[PDB]
Amino acid sequence: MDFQNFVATLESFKDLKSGISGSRIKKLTTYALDHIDIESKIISLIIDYSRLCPDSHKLGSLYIIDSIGRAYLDETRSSSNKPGTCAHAINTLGEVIQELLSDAIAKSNQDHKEKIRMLLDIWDRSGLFQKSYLNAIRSKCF
Amino acid sequence: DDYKLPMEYIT
Predict the structure, then answer these.
(1) How close, in Å, is residue B9 to chain A by CA atoms?
(2) What are phi and psi of A82, to 5 degrees?
(3) Structural domains in chain A, sorted by start
(4) Which three-class secondary structure string do you get for chain A?
(5) How far apart are CA A73 and CA A76, in angstroms?
(6) Among A36, A58, A109, A133, which residue is least crowded by beta carbons within 10 Å?
């Protein structure tokens, strides 16, 4: 699997009605874990996938970020802005996560909003993003 | 083929 396969796999989410596939998300995460040397390009792509995917697929884009983000987080526990590090990838995600969350919520139906809220809670408990960032979104968008 | 969320951060 090379970077073009990663692009193609992410792009294939357009053909899922729900925008969600556990096995495909795992495939993207395994790729992200195996190519941390190019995390900057991977993280840019999944950020931009969340920005550009259809409204009903926003939730799935946050699941992609959940899976890669927490997979990267679990590695950091075993330089904040050195390209090629899990830490930098997570900082990059965190700098855009408020934008991505508030747009996802605005475009989500009620059931997806509740699933986004629980994802917010998971991110709070797991330490993936700053609690301040997350609580801020919780107050403004819900 | 849904996305399995982590129970240790849910319950």
Answers:
(1) 5
(2) -95, 115
(3) 1-142 (1.25.40.90)
(4) CCHHHHHHHHHHHHHCCCCCCHHHHHHHHHHHHHCHHHHHHHHHHHHHHHHHCCHHHHHHHHHHHHHHHHHHHHHHHCCCCCCCCHHHHHHHHHHHHHHHHHHHHHHCCHHHHHHHHHHHHHHHHHCCCCHHHHHHHHHHHC
(5) 5
(6) A109
The method recorded for this entry reads: X-ray
DSSP B7: G
Tell me the structure's resolution in angstroms, rounded to a single decimal.
Answer: 2.1
Chain B partners within 8 Å of A122 (Cβ): 5-6, 9-10
Q: Which of residues 1-11 of B touch A (CB under 8 A)?
A: 1-6, 9-10
Angle between helices A3-11 and A22-34 (to 10 degrees): 160
Q: Which two tokens stand for residue A58?
A: 């926003």
Q: Are A9 and A24 in contact (CB under 8 A)?
A: yes
Q: Which residues of B1-11 are buried (b: 16+ CB within 10 A; e: fewer)?
A: eebeeeeebee
The pair of structure tokens assigned to A102 is: 């508030």
Q: What distance in Å separates the CA atoms of residue A133 and residue A6, rounded to the nearest whole number?
A: 29
Q: How far apart are CA A47 and CA A133, in angstroms?
A: 17
